[PDB]
C-alpha cells in the first residue's frame, strides 16, 4: 500500500490560486499527517482526489482547472473563521 498526503495553501491576496506547498508518500505522508495533528490543520480523506492531486500537481505548483471546485469545497470546510 502507498500512503499519500497533499498539503494545500491558500491565502487571499497572496496566492492567486490554491498552492500545493508540500506532498508526501509512504513515510513522508505519515509525517505530514502527524504534523497536521500537531498544528491542528484539517485533514480530509478523499482517495480519488488525493491520488489525482498527487499525480498532477507537483510541490510548489498551483492547482489546475480540474481541481478548482473540489479544492474550493475543501477550503470552505477547512478555513478558520478566527472567531
Amino acid at each position: 500500500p502507498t500512503a499519500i498526503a497533499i498539503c494545500l495553501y491558500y491565502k487571499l491576496g497572496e496566492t492567486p490560486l490554491p498552492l500545493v506547498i508540500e506532498t508526501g508518500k509512504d513515510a513522508k505522508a505519515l509525517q505530514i499527517i502527524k504534523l497536521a495533528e500537531l498544528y491542528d490543520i484539517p485533514v480530509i480523506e478523499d482517495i480519488p482526489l488525493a491520488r489525482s492531486l498527487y499525480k498532477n500537481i507537483h510541490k510548489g505548483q498551483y492547482i489546475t482547472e480540474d481541481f478548482f471546485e473540489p479544492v474550493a469545497q475543501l477550503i470552505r470546510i477547512a478555513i478558520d473563521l478566527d472567531y
Binding site: A3, L8, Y9, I21, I32, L35, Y39, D46, L53, A78
Partner: peptide, 17 residues
C-alpha cells in the same frame, strides 16, 4: 531543517488517501 514543519503549520488543508 524545519521547512516541512513550517509548511504544514501555515497550511490550509491536507488531503490524504
Amino acid at each position: 531543517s524545519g521547512s516541512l514543519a513550517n509548511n504544514i503549520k501555515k497550511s490550509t488543508v491536507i488531503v490524504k488517501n
